[PDB]
Amino acid sequence: TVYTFPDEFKLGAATASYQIEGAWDENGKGPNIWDTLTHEHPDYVVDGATGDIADDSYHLYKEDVKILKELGAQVYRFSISWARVLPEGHDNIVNQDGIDYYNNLINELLANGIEPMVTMYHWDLPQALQDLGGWPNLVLAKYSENYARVLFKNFGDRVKLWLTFNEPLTFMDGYASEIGMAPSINTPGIGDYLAAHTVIHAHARIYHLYDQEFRAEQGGKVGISLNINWCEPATNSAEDRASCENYQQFNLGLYAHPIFTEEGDYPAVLKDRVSRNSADEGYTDSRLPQFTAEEVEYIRGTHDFLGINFYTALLGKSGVEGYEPSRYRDSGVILTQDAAWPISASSWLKVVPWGFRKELNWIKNEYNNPPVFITENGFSDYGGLNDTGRVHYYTEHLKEMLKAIHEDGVNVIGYTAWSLMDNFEWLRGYSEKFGIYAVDFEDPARPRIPKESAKVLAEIMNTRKIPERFRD
Numbered sequence: 001t002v003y004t005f006p007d008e009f010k011l012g013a014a015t016a017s018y019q020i021e022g023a024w025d026e027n028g029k030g031p032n033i034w035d036t037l038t039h040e041h042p043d044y045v046v047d048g049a050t051g052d053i054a055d056d057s058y059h060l061y062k063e064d065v066k067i068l069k070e071l072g073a074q075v076y077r078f079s080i081s082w083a084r085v086l087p088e089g090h091d092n093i094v095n096q097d098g099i100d101y102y103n104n105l106i107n108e109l110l111a112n113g114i115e116p117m118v119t120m121y122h123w124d125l126p127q128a129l130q131d132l133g134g135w136p137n138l139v140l141a142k143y144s145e146n147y148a149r150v151l152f153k154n155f156g157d158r159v160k161l162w163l164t165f166n167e168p169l170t171f172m173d174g175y176a177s178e179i180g181m182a183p184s185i186n187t188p189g190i191g192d193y194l195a196a197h198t199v200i201h202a203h204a205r206i207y208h209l210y211d212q213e214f215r216a217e218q219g220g221k222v223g224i225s226l227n228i229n230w231c232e233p234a235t236n237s238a239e240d241r242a243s244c245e246n247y248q249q250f251n252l253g254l255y256a257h258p259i260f261t262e263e264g265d266y267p268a269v270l271k272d273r274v275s276r277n278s279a280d281e282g283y284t285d286s287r288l289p290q291f292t293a294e295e296v297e298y299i300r301g302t303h304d305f306l307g308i309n310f311y312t313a314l315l316g317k318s319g320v321e322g323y324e325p326s327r328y329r330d331s332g333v334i335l336t337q338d339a340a341w342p343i344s345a346s347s348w349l350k351v352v353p354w355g356f357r358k359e360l361n362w363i364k365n366e367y368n369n370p371p372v373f374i375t376e377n378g379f380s381d382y383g384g385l386n387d388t389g390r391v392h393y394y395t396e397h398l399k400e401m402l403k404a405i406h407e408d409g410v411n412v413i414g415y416t417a418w419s420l421m422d423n424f425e426w427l428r429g430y431s432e433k434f435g436i437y438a439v440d441f442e443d444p445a446r447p448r449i450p451k452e453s454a455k456v457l458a459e460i461m462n463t464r465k466i467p468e469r470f471r472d
């Protein structure tokens with residue numbers, strides 16, 4: 001039993017637009033902040049890589065569907081490029097080529113028995129909107145609503161699973177470093193919080209829009225994809241436990257407390273620690289933006305499920321470190337990794353599968369067991385088809401998830417592996433490989449070829465169980 005997927009559980013794989021599509025200026029697509037970063041600041045990216053071509057999925061989408069069908073995916077999670085649909089960011093111009101492209105992908109998926117799951121925003125903000133300040137500027141919440149309306153109107157007759165945002169915890173950091181994630185702005189502890197605030201408002205507007213304009217007719221579900229690392233106490237002390245709770249609240253709770261709790265608003269510890277730190281440093285006003293009571297009520301409850309991206313764990317101990325001001329310093333935890341944990345090709349990613357089960361339980365308890373869709377989980381290497389590390393990563397994480405479901409009663413409803421294929425890994429370029437299919441980025445045809453992990457995942461998807469040879 002503990003090794004079998006529930007009958008209704010959905011298995012598949014995931015990608016994101018900038019990471020795979022290419023065709024960055026083709027057929028009317030406007031520029032986004034990742035076009036800007038990779039063109040103007042190749043020094044920020046391994047190898048000076050760009051997403052100009054990537055996997056060429058703009059042209060090769062039928063090949064993506066082919067490998068999804070081979071895999072036996074029930075669901076394909078992909079994102080829509082805002083500037084491919086609305087090249088000016090605002091909704092005055094709708095690019096028919098972009099509409100056609102995503103319709104073609106959706107129709108090809110459905111014709112092959114694969115359900116689309118669409119992320120509206122996976123980090124590729126139109127440059128025209130960044131030029132107003134981007135996410136720190138609250139005007140983007142209405143612009144986001146208008147973008148979502150175009151998506152629901154055009155695609156919602158065939159798409160029943162939506163994610164408003166992917167990893168705002170990550171993309172807010174694009175406003176906390178001059179050399180990091182697009183748009184590479186250095187406003188740590190100030191602009192990143194403003195970005196989060198706008199995103200939360202935007203998410204809520206999109207959810208209400210769906211309720212008001214589309215749900216009765218379309219009958220789908222709207223969630224949001226939040227990343228979170230498990231944070232294990234470095235020692236069993238109450239003090240180290242407190243630091244790990246701080247971590248959860250400052251990373252997951254920042255977004256999930258406003259949306260997924262009955263109370264809404266930011267977590268109290270977030271409000272209180274930032275207020276105290278801001279006062280101590282002489283600011284008249286807290287660096288953390290505030291919601292009014294009316295906003296709190298508007299935002300809370302704006303969900304049909306919780307999307308989770310899970311990869312790894314950290315150790316947390318009592319204390320404070322980081323630069324003043326910053327979210328990490330405000331969070332009141334000292335974070336490390338255990339040297340014993342297996343490594344990957346990514347500095348930040350260690351293999352800690354039991355952390356996945358711990359995190360799922362934390363979520364169950366904090367948010368009253370919401371339906372949870374695992375929208376990403378995966379592992380990096382530098383290359384190779386005999387990807388034993390990736391196979392082990394998947395089989396262990398799936399086993400831990402199945403224990404969470406069957407032993408712990410966590411309502412996990414689906415899982416999409418990150419990623420269907422090797423792709424443009426942001427500031428790491430093509431140097432870190434997360435695919436279950438390999439792609440030759442030196443071959444203009446960008447062939448996708450299965451790794452051992454694709455074969456093992458196909459076996460898991462076909463049999464709906466963890467094969468005996470991978471069991472404890």
Ligand code: NA
Pocket residue numbers: 094150153154
């Ligand atoms: Na339209």
